[PDB]
Amino acid sequence: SKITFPKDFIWGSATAAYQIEGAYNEDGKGESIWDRFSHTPGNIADGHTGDVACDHYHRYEEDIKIMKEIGIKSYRFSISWPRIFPEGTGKLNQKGLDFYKRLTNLLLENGIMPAITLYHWDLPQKLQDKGGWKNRDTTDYFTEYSEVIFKNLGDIVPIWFTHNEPGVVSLLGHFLGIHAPGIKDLRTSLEVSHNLLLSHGKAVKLFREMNIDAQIGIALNLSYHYPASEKAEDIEAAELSFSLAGRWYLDPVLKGRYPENALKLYKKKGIELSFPEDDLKLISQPIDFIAFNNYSSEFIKYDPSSESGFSPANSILEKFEKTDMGWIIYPEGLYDLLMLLDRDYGKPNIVISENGAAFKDEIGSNGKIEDTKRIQYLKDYLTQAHRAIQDGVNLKAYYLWSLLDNFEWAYGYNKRFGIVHVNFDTLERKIKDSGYWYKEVIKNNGFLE
Amino acid sequence: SKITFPKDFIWGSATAAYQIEGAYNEDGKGESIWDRFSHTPGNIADGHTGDVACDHYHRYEEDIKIMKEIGIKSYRFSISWPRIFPEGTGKLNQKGLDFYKRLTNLLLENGIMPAITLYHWDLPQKLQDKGGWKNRDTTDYFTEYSEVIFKNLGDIVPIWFTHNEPGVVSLLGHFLGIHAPGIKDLRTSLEVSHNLLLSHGKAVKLFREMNIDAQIGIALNLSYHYPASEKAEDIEAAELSFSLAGRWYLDPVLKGRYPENALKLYKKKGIELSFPEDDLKLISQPIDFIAFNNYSSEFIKYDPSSESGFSPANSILEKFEKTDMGWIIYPEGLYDLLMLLDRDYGKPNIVISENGAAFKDEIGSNGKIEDTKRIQYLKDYLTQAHRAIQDGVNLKAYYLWSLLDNFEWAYGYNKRFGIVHVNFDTLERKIKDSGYWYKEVIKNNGFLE
Amino acid sequence: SKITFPKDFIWGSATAAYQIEGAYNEDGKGESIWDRFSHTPGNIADGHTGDVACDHYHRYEEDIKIMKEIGIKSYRFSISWPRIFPEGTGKLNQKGLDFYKRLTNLLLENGIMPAITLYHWDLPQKLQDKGGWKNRDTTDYFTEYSEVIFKNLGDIVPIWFTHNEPGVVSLLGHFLGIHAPGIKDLRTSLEVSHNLLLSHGKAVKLFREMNIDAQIGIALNLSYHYPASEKAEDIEAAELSFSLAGRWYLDPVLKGRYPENALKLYKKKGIELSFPEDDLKLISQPIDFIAFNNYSSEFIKYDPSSESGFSPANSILEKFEKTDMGWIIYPEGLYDLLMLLDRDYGKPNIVISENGAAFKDEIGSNGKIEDTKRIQYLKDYLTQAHRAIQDGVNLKAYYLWSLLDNFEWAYGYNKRFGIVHVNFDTLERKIKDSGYWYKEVIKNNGFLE
């Protein structure tokens, strides 16, 4: 049985700015919280940095020539705020604009469709010195930068993402402090979460004011949260996890509310926050699709000693193959999620900003990367992607994470999500077999499962 | 006739901390009443000590590898209080927690299910300088150390024991003074018995407050006490024994009372003392199972000689084969006991925390320990264990005392309960034939008697 | 059930130049490595040679009249390089050209479709004096000769084969040394394998630079390699055997890469060789079809004793009927292979350059060769050929090895794969019953199996 996606279905591959671009202090780019976080011992694996990375900034021509060789119909990327405004507000750095302008015009001229992400974590370090996302003034400055991009690139770019995974930014970056800007306070973490969503709201409101002939959305970190057992205590423990995690951002967008069962968990520890009612009507602002990033699924159990009230069910996850990240493989966990978004939020247009996997890659004696596991992963998860479309889901796009091997944040360059192998000493690209697989999948518009 | 145990039946082997661990002054471990007692002439056979013993502290990786090679489904061990709190209370020794945390995680990552005893006789010597278990305060401090263990290892460890054989600790350690701490006063011996039970009651109460997803119990020394003859004076004499011995700790924990016939014999010697009624409702606290340690059975006659009005029956006992300890072999004694725990105390869940036997082992010319008498002993007693389960008993677990040859207290190293021989000069393990037997008995889930 | 092939299905029979032509030093023909290898004691059975053979060079008229009598729709034959260039390069021998030019025109005029192989092992002996296929210059000279054949015979000949069984040439000719040119060195044997594939590339590249209105390909020696048992060691042993054997030529040509699991085996003996990257893109050069030569199948087990890591599973093979070659008869082992080529190389067009069998033939008292076993063999393998086409395989052609009895290399004339008997004293052709059977199979376009 050979499977075929809708004839209009946009195939793509995704990257971030800091994870590929390099040139961290070139052409008047301001310092970001990631430049800062990376240059401090104990933050990044092996002391790695995003100083050079894939050096896309100089080698983008080579990349596009690879992107077209595989024949992706859409290339999802991020704009570095600190290349546009070094100081986050005020003096425009025209050199930065003209990089991304030029890049987008090469894409449109190589018959590839641009898909920008406006914030992919690289907040200008100057704003971090005035409180960063905790300072509500940042949400205004994010709109200013948004404005300038829309004036230049508005009409000609069809697919916009305001934010990438605000879930992680606030959780890792502002509570656990293992991501930039390295802060560790729960209260701040929630005040940033709001201030992120608000900034999304302002950017969509501006997007409409300026009347850009293109589609906007938000890229959220999302998994399915299964209960450990079909018991009243576990099913509830899992509902709470999803609410803290993904639903905390899904409901304020889409439903104009925060999840209750999560809010009750915060106030049971002596944290309440008066959301201004008018902000939630600005966050809920209609959007042309919902985008998300999926890799794995969570299996939550009851735990009345974990101050959360729950924990991972280590008895159940030790039955799966686990990827190089230590995340389970479970392809049907994508289907169920796509059906959960379809059900609970009124059959919206869905995009997948990011799916993909990290396995240990080698270049063999044949000078090739035969990453059969990545390919196996890919087609397993894309079969469930198709299954969902057949059972009614409005899944318009799939973007593969990632196009190149890149900087994986606090893991450094010790993790490869690329379909194009990158040697971080020579910056030489060797298109993986998962890359040659994908080329055919785009051509045939599917594969024989 | 081939016997097969319930399909859910957990097979296990047991050890204690002082008896195997060694490293008696390493990584900030505080001195224990046993370290102190062992260092004094006239207390241990041949001036033996724990100090080194099996050196399990360092060689645990080797020991797990053997445990898995035999393929026990549960390892019952003891946590050293004086590794956790060198001064009983106050400054936490994180080194000692990290040992047991690591050890448990090596068991869970091999085949093996952990079973933790919280007090196997190694009271920090500091608390003994403020009276020890005579000072009621110690019962609180036990709860403090219990709390720290539950926070770390609470729900990932399924089976918990509060105490090991408080019957011996009070009798031998605080009246006969042949165990540590070497005290010889009758009043003190009863005040400790209480204080020990109370401490169990406080740990179970705290266990519930924290709401740990695991099962807690208490490991009692228990034999059957047969009358010498089927006569009114000898049946009564035997009831009074058992009541001084085992029932003194069974009735408080499961019936919330002290045995009357025993209490009457105390008061006939001019001792009462008012147990606070509220304590014995704290002791009685419901528990998930009763555990016990059995080896032999007692044959009591009536005796107006002996201040207890009873004695052993010398030459009924001189009709049995005897172990190397001088204890009779009588397998059917275990059945009757299991039936006595079942009938009285309301068909509880039963665990065997310890059963085994000590015979004079040699390494033969073939470099092997052919301990046919330990194997014979074992299978004999395990036929009467099975026979009880068939006649309705709820015996969920068997733990074989002991996994390793170890420090047998006042007898020193002169007595071997191990499957797995240990040379106490070289610290070389040689799995005994009783070991290899047990391996198969686990695998088949039984044996043809 | 009567089976019928596609209406467009091209039925053929095949011969080679050295095996049938004779006239080994006539009309200016240069000496070949097979002339040379044949004239040396110890190489060919019974001291046979191909000096005369079938003497097709003179008697081709008779042979075409036979070919048409049976009514084959295509005749696959080989061009002797040494007849075209006696010295490999330089002075053209017009006499040689005119032979093959004449031959091809007699085939077209008798309504038979030509199918030319360009190299079927007869490398001019002068090039073998400058190193032969080990000297890369040979790969350029091959292209010169390929150029002169295309100029003359390009358009009018529909089906072209660059090489026959380079697998055997390198393995048997250059490692085992039991074929010409008799060399015995492993390193050399791989350097020749590459150089051969390179020459194939150069010939296609030239075939496309001139835009000859005809379909080119390569004829590879291919079996199916079953694992002795459905076990991880034996599945893996078989994959390595197929990799060393056929896949070593399939992958370069159809995937532009050498098999990894094979390359690893070679480096583990201390042999790595840097193939220039550009050569493998030249080898991969798209081709109209893949042709292959099957007779039998292999059954490989795991073997650490063999430095290869595997060995033949004689225990299994000794359960089949065997040809006169000793090779097993296993019809289904064609089906599985046609599916393997279909699956693993993107459903290409497939030809069968050769299939057939050798059995001991006699001329009976009736002056006829009733070779029922060869007819049985044929119809058993053709039923599975059909089966594969039904189950979706793009098998366009079947060429029966061989039209005539001929010189079977090291075996001499001691083996008969003909459907036309040839007395090698008189050179008299007696069409075999297999020949008369095939004639009806072509007419009916099938048979009731």
Catalytic residue at A165? yes
Give A208-230 as a DSSP string.
HHHT-SSEEEEEEE---EEESSS
Q: How many CB atoms lie within 10 A of CB B436?
A: 15
Q: How many CB atoms lie within 10 A of CB B64?
A: 18
Query: Is the Cβ–Cβ distance between A17 and A122 less than 8 Å?
Result: yes
Q: How many CB atoms lie within 10 A of CB C98?
A: 12
Contacts with A237 from chain B: Cβ below 8 Å: none
Give which of A365, A370, A433 to mutate to test C binding, by max C Cβ within 10 Å: A365
CB contact under 8 A, C264 and A367: no
Residues 6+ apart with CB under 8 A from B246: B167, B220, B221, B222, B223, B292
Alpha-carbon distance A10 to A353, whole Å? Answer: 11
CB pairs under 8 A between A and C: 19
Residue B11 C-alpha, separation from nearest chain A C-alpha, in angstroms = 20
- The helix/strand/coil state of A401 is strand
Beta bridge partners of A298: A225
Query: Is the Cβ–Cβ distance between C62 and C31 less than 8 Å?
Result: no
Contacts with A304 from chain B: Cβ below 8 Å: 210-211, 213
- The helix/strand/coil state of B403 is coil
Query: Is the Cβ–Cβ distance between B197 and B166 less than 8 Å?
Result: yes
Contacts with C263 from chain A: Cβ below 8 Å: 364-366
Radius of gyration from C-alpha coordinates of chain B: 21
In this complex, the chains that touch C, judged by 3 or more CB pairs closer than 8 A, are A
| Paired tokens of A129 | 């010195």
Residue B211 C-alpha, separation from nearest chain A C-alpha, in angstroms = 6
- The helix/strand/coil state of A344 is helix
Residues 6+ apart with CB under 8 A from A267: none
Contacts with A370 from chain C: Cβ below 8 Å: 260
Experimental technique for the deposited model: X-ray
Contacts with A305 from chain B: Cβ below 8 Å: 150-151, 154-155, 210-212
Question: What b-and-e string marks burial along B18-35, b requiring 16 or more CB atoms within 10 Å of the CB?
Answer: bbbbbbbeeeebbbbbbb
| Paired tokens of A188 | 């701040």
Q: Taking phi first (over 0 means left), then psi (-120 to 50 degrees means alpha), and beta for anything else, what does residue C192 get?
A: alpha
Radius of gyration from C-alpha coordinates of chain A: 21
Alpha-carbon distance B419 to B417, whole Å? Answer: 7
CB contact under 8 A, A365 and C257: no
Alpha-carbon distance A405 to A428, whole Å? Answer: 11
Residue A324 C-alpha, separation from nearest chain C C-alpha, in angstroms = 22
Q: How many CB atoms lie within 10 A of CB A107?
A: 23
Write the CA distances from A113 to A58, A109, A155, A323, integer angstroms. 21, 9, 12, 31
Residues 6+ apart with CB under 8 A from C368: C430, C433
The nearest alpha carbon in chain A to B151 belongs to A305
* Crossing angle of helices A234-242 and A260-267, rounded to 10°: 90
Q: How many helices (H) and strands (E) does chain A have?
A: 16, 15
Alpha-carbon distance A75 to A98, whole Å? Answer: 18
Contacts with C267 from chain A: Cβ below 8 Å: 365
Q: How many CB atoms lie within 10 A of CB C288?
A: 17
CB contact under 8 A, A370 and C258: no
Active-site annotation holder among B21, B31, B298, B354:
B354
Run of H or E including A197: helix A186-210
CA B67 vs. chain centroid, Å, equals: 20
Which residue is associated with the tokens 């005119």?
Answer: C98
CB contact under 8 A, C272 and A366: no
* Crossing angle of helices C332-344 and C372-390, rounded to 10°: 30
| Paired tokens of C317 | 């093979």
Which residue is associated with the tokens 């008993």?
Answer: B393
Beta bridge partners of C114: C75
Residues of B with CB under 8 A from a CB of A: 150-151, 154-155, 210-213
The nearest alpha carbon in chain A to C265 belongs to A365
- The helix/strand/coil state of B273 is coil
Radius of gyration from C-alpha coordinates of chain C: 21
Query: Is the Cβ–Cβ distance between B31 and B125 less than 8 Å?
Result: yes
Alpha-carbon distance B301 to B360, whole Å? Answer: 31
SS (H, E, C) B183-241: CCCHHHHHHHHHHHHHHHHHHHHHHHHHCCCCEEEEEEECCCEEECCCCHHHHHHHHHH
Active-site annotation holder among C191, C298, C354, C408:
C354
Which amino acid appears at position A94 of this protein? Answer: Q
B–C touching, 3+ CB–CB pairs within 8 Å: no
Residues 6+ apart with CB under 8 A from B103: B60, B77
Which residue is associated with the tokens 């210059």?
Answer: C137
CB contact under 8 A, A303 and B213: yes
Q: Taking phi first (over 0 means left), then psi (-120 to 50 degrees means alpha), and beta for anything else, what does residue A367 get?
A: left
Contacts 24+ apart (CB under 8 A), B414-419: B414/B45, B414/B46, B414/B48, B415/B324, B415/B325, B415/B358, B416/B324, B416/B358, B416/B359, B416/B360, B416/B361, B417/B356, B417/B357, B417/B358, B418/B361, B419/B13, B419/B70, B419/B374
- Is the omega angle on the peptide bond into residue A402 within 30 degrees of 0, that is, cis? yes
Residue A291 C-alpha, separation from nearest chain B C-alpha, in angstroms = 38
Contacts with A368 from chain C: Cβ below 8 Å: 257, 260
Residues of A with CB under 8 A from a CB of C: 364-368, 370
C–A touching, 3+ CB–CB pairs within 8 Å: yes
Alpha-carbon distance A255 to A243, whole Å? Answer: 13
CB pairs under 8 A between A and B: 13
Run of H or E including A74: strand A74-78
Mark out the alpha helices in A154-185 (DSSP H runs): 166-171
In B17-168 the beta strands, taken as DSSP E runs, fall at 74-78, 113-119, 159-164
By C-alpha distance, which of A332, A441, A386 is closest to A6? Answer: A386
Alpha-carbon distance A210 to A155, whole Å? Answer: 10
Give which of C257, C274, C342 to mutate to test A binding, by max A Cβ within 10 Å: C257
Alpha-carbon distance A201 to A216, whole Å? Answer: 11
Residues 6+ apart with CB under 8 A from A26: A57
Write the CA distances from B59 to A312, A417, B65, B422, B428, integer angstroms. 31, 41, 10, 12, 10
Alpha-carbon distance A79 to A99, whole Å? Answer: 10
CB contact under 8 A, C260 and A365: yes
| Paired tokens of A237 | 């423990």
Run of H or E including B14: strand B10-14
Alpha-carbon distance B190 to A403, whole Å? Answer: 76
Query: Is the Cβ–Cβ distance between A435 and A419 less than 8 Å?
Result: yes
Catalytic residue at C144? no
Alpha-carbon distance B312 to B299, whole Å? Answer: 6
Contacts with B155 from chain A: Cβ below 8 Å: 303, 305
Residue B112 C-alpha, separation from nearest chain A C-alpha, in angstroms = 13
Alpha-carbon distance C207 to C162, whole Å? Answer: 10
SS (H, E, C) chain C: CEEECCCCCEEEEECCHHHHCCCCCCCCCCCEHHHHHHCCCCCCHHHCCCCCCCCHHHHHHHHHHHHHHHCCCEEEEECCHHHHCCCCCCCCCHHHHHHHHHHHHHHHHCCCEEEEEEECCCCEHHHHHCCHHHCCHHHHHHHHHHHHHHHHHCCCCCEEEEEECHHHHHHHHHHHCCCCCCCCCHHHHHHHHHHHHHHHHHHHHHHHHCCCCCEEEEEEECCCEEECCCCHHHHHHHHHHHHHHHHHHHHHHHHCCCCHHHHHHHHCCCCCCCCCHHHHHHHHCCCCCEEEECCCCEEEEECCCCCCCEEECHHHHCCCCECCCCCECCCHHHHHHHHHHHHHCCCCCEEEEEECCCCCCCCCCCCCCCCHHHHHHHHHHHHHHHHHHHCCCCEEEEEEECCECCCCHHHCCCCCCCCEEECCCCCCEEECHHHHHHHHHHHHCEEEC
Which amino acid appears at position A297 of this protein? Answer: S
Beta strands A298-302 and A225-227 are: parallel
By C-alpha distance, which of C128, C144, C140, C125 is closest to C188? Answer: C128
Alpha-carbon distance A307 to C71, whole Å? Answer: 87
A–B touching, 3+ CB–CB pairs within 8 Å: yes
Residues of C with CB under 8 A from a CB of A: 257-260, 263-264, 266-267, 272, 277
Query: Is the Cβ–Cβ distance between C433 and C372 less than 8 Å?
Result: yes
The nearest alpha carbon in chain B to A303 belongs to B213
Query: Is the Cβ–Cβ distance between A159 and A74 less than 8 Å?
Result: yes
Alpha-carbon distance C77 to B306, whole Å? Answer: 116
| Paired tokens of C264 | 């690893």
Beta strands C446-448 and C2-4 are: antiparallel
Alpha-carbon distance A173 to A43, whole Å? Answer: 11
**Which candidate from A365, A368, A370 shows the least CB-CB separation from C272?**
A365
Write the CA distances from A33 to A180, A186, C307, integer angstroms. 6, 19, 57
Alpha-carbon distance B420 to B431, whole Å? Answer: 4
Residue C267 C-alpha, separation from nearest chain A C-alpha, in angstroms = 8
Alpha-carbon distance A284 to A198, whole Å? Answer: 9
Query: Is the Cβ–Cβ distance between A297 and A245 less than 8 Å?
Result: no
Alpha-carbon distance B275 to B280, whole Å? Answer: 8
Run of H or E including A316: helix A314-317
Give which of A300, A305, A314 to mutate to test B binding, by max B Cβ within 10 Å: A305
Query: Is the Cβ–Cβ distance between C403 and C419 less than 8 Å?
Result: yes
Query: What dihedral do alpha carbons C235, C238, C239, C244 form, nearest 10°?
Result: 160
Contacts with A366 from chain C: Cβ below 8 Å: 257-260, 263
By C-alpha distance, which of A190, A213, A198, A197 is closest to A265? Answer: A190
CB contact under 8 A, A303 and B155: yes
Kindly state the greatest CA–CA separation across chain C.
62
After what residues is chain C interrupted, C–N > 2.5 A?
none
Write the CA distances from A248 to A166, B449, C243, integer angstroms. 10, 63, 53
In this complex, the chains that touch B, judged by 3 or more CB pairs closer than 8 A, are A
By C-alpha distance, which of C389, C292, C401 is closest to C355? Answer: C401
Alpha-carbon distance C233 to B449, whole Å? Answer: 41
Residue B403 C-alpha, separation from nearest chain A C-alpha, in angstroms = 27
Alpha-carbon distance A437 to C211, whole Å? Answer: 31
Active-site annotation holder among C21, C165, C191, C408:
C165
Query: Is the Cβ–Cβ distance between B430 and B420 less than 8 Å?
Result: yes
Residue B7 C-alpha, separation from nearest chain A C-alpha, in angstroms = 20
Query: Is the Cβ–Cβ distance between B324 and B236 less than 8 Å?
Result: no
